[PDB]
Amino acid sequence: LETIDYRAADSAKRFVESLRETGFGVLSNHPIDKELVERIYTEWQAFFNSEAKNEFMFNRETHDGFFPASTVKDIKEYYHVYPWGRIPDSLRANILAYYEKANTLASELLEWIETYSPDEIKAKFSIPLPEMIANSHKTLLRILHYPPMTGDEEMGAIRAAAHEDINLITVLPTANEPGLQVKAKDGSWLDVPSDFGNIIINIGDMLQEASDGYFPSTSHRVINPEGTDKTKSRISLPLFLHPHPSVVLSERYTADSYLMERLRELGVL
Amino acid sequence: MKLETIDYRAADSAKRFVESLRETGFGVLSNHPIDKELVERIYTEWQAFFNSEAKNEFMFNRETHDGFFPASIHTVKDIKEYYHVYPWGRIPDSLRANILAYYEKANTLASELLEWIETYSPDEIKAKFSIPLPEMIANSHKTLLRILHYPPMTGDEEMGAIRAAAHEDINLITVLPTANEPGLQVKAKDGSWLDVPSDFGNIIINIGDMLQEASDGYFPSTSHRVINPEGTDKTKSRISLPLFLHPHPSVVLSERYTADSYLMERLRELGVL
Amino acid sequence: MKLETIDYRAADSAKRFVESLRETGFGVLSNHPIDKELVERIYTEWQAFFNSEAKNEFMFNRETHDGFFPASVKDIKEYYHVYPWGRIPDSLRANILAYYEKANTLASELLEWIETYSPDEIKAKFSIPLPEMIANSHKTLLRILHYPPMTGDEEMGAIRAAAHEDINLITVLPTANEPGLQVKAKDGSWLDVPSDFGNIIINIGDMLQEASDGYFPSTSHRVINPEGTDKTKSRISLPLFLHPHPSVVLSERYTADSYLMERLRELGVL
Amino acid sequence: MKLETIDYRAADSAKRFVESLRETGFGVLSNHPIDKELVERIYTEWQAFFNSEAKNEFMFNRETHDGFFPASISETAKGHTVKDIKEYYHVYPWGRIPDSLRANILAYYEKANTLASELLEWIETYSPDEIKAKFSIPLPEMIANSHKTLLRILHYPPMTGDEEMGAIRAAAHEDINLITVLPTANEPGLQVKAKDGSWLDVPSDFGNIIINIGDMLQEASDGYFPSTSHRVINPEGTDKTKSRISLPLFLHPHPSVVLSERYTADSYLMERLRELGVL
Ligand SMILES: [Cl-]
Ligand SMILES: [Cl-]
Ligand SMILES: [Cl-]
Ligand SMILES: [Cl-]
Ligand SMILES: [Cl-]
Ligand SMILES: [Cl-]
Ligand SMILES: [Cl-]
Fold it and tell me: Residue limits of the Fe2OG dioxygenase domain (chain D) (predicted)?
């Protein structure tokens, strides 16, 4: 999986072709203020290390807020940020500044995808791809925190199980902790280059459907390669771009009916 | 990777079956105890149900999603319609007796098969099961029998190469009778697609995400799909009767999840409000 | 307006009971078939359950809302949602499902009575016989409510349970001689519900009001803490909320399922 | 009898308005600041919306329940039909709105939130100091940019032929939310339950706006402001062949707002759902 220079004359073309083949695209030298991202990591790490985080227990109805690890206990805790949702006062400015900058970049990347789609694929998009996410109510910024392992606790081979994203596209800065991998056509796992300043973008199931399979939603995971430090906290900031529910993806589905169908496949009551 | 048809009746069928599941996520049994004629009668009478406008009297309950789901509600239309049958749920009077008799028989077999899976797990895997596998599904509220119907393609409707897209099941195990319509395929470790033998009298079992979790990845939940191979008659209806065995939500799967907290996290992962 | 205790065994009890429902939304029966000693045993063992650490292993399932709900900002009651299909502690299962069946059997009889004494013109509005609406109903709920004792410097308010109407078909509740339950009268006053040991209280809910075109009213009710209610005692109650199948046709305008959906839309639930 | 119409312009209006709410759960304002012709423009174009089959393109989203809700017809086992007497549209700033209607309806939403915010200031100002102290944050802050606040556009279609109009159009109910705000249009029938069990008529002239306390403000104010039962009857003379449009705006607090020692808005709703037996 090759890292592409956002500044390069041919970057758009190579980026979308990366998406078409692998389902993923990696960009270095991107326009999102890198010092803003590190500021964000620091202050959210403080937040997760604080007792005050429990004041923001997620709302039962809408699932915006803080989700603690916990009987049974998961190995991550997280926070769901929505522009419309509950956000702590002292973290609001930065996180929404990032949210907006990430959306704007996503919107540009969606233009690129549409530009370099063949005419027979372009013709299947009910509206232009960037419009599908403009002021999307469902777009979610997930602040993920994996805490240090304490004492006896043993770290697994796999940190995040293999999976496909359901949404349109997902945007994630890396933090130079290798482990993210994507499924290749031949059953092997390709390592996503995760140097500082890279941003990783991937196709989710709804753009796969909108494109009639042309852009594939690829299974991906995060492993713990040999010599990963069990005592370090890992924070990550994935942004899941969702289309408006009423967007017609194909002759078979709208975004809303595609989601409901998934809910029935999973047997959710 | 090959997918072998195991004769249920054979003295060593349990060990081979559980080993097939361990390697591929799937197990195929012939000469199984479920009455083949019951199943045929079920296809005939539900085919008739889907071919009547009276099916619309059974529009699914909005609260609990039991009942009839049509292909359609400018406008958009899926290539299938289906019915969600639960013992507790709405079922048409004329179809109740047979479909629930099938539900019981398929549950009783699934229950035996889970005994097999436990028996032939190594001690260090057995030891991760919070309760015996069969107890996870006994009288399960969530176990879903889906009656799936792909209607005839009409006029100049075109048939895609893929009927049901690559997916994994989330639940514990899923049990499906075949009916000599090739197409169901399972993902091999080398990125290729294996055909599942689909002769009359075969029943197909597969590992779901919750049993992968419970076994610490020892039994894999494998990607599968249904293609429309060359010669598939676009004008023929297809009915199928998949049974999705769900553990009780309070089942501890592992140090990390109950069945309930596993499903909840899936929903947060998908961005469901 | 007054609320009369009607002896279930009386020759004319059905007629009087139904007229009580029509006039007030409520009927009170004494000498009913449910064994007092079962109910006593249920109170006793569920009290112990709530007054234990064991309860926290039965935290309600997030998806289907069956199981235990702690007070856990802090409410003044905790409770358990019991369904025949749902989670139930092993040690409590047999008695509580025994009670569930007996209370359902009695509810079924009481629904026959209600239908029998409805005028023809009201009978005609019932899409199916009233008892069939609840036979093997997935949604019927047995709620076990526990108000714990006041601890230390906590004050006990005048109203234990705020004025409300039930949404369902009918609701069935044994009393254990703790006065406080009240029903709103037509003149705006509150009528005390006689709550002697051995009484069972039945009331019309909104869906049976709809199904009967207003003929049987779903009446506002509340529970107060009268003067000298002992703040240091627990209270347990066993309300059974009988819910029609979602697909039951209540009227020209609603099924049970669409009635509920309309209520969620009115409440602004996303 | 009737509730008092209070002229917004009068100097003592605020004081008398808050007292009407305390006494009856409701307040009626005339000559309010919301442009009369905006409200008329909205009635007109939404009536138009419901009078077309193009509305069906905006079928509500199943996940989030924003959009258009038809009165679907279904047929039963005995050849009866089930069909509500109203269809409606749920408008949220974040939700789906038809392009041709967005500007006016969001301008109205903004303007009505502004009035409701002033009215909540009024409610706080004239609360006694002991009641003021029960509000965890200022009342207006509870609804500022609230995600849950809902503008529900209701349409009762004409009946023709032998179709019967019932004596009751909307059943007696309470609002769960903080406050609700409703312009009227000279269609009598909205009533409020008085303390002695009788029904009070609400003066419903054009240019009136009706405001009522909801359960969450009753809870926040420890019963000082009552959430009162109201209904809509079809009084003698109501013409069944006429459409009726109405625009109630339900102001909901942020979920995380603490209402009392016992509930947040979120835990209060969850409790209602559990009491209702919603799975
Ligand atoms: Cl939308
Ligand atoms: Cl359970
Ligand atoms: Cl999924
Ligand atoms: Cl039903
Ligand atoms: Cl005046
Ligand atoms: Cl909030
Ligand atoms: Cl309610």
Answer: 145-253
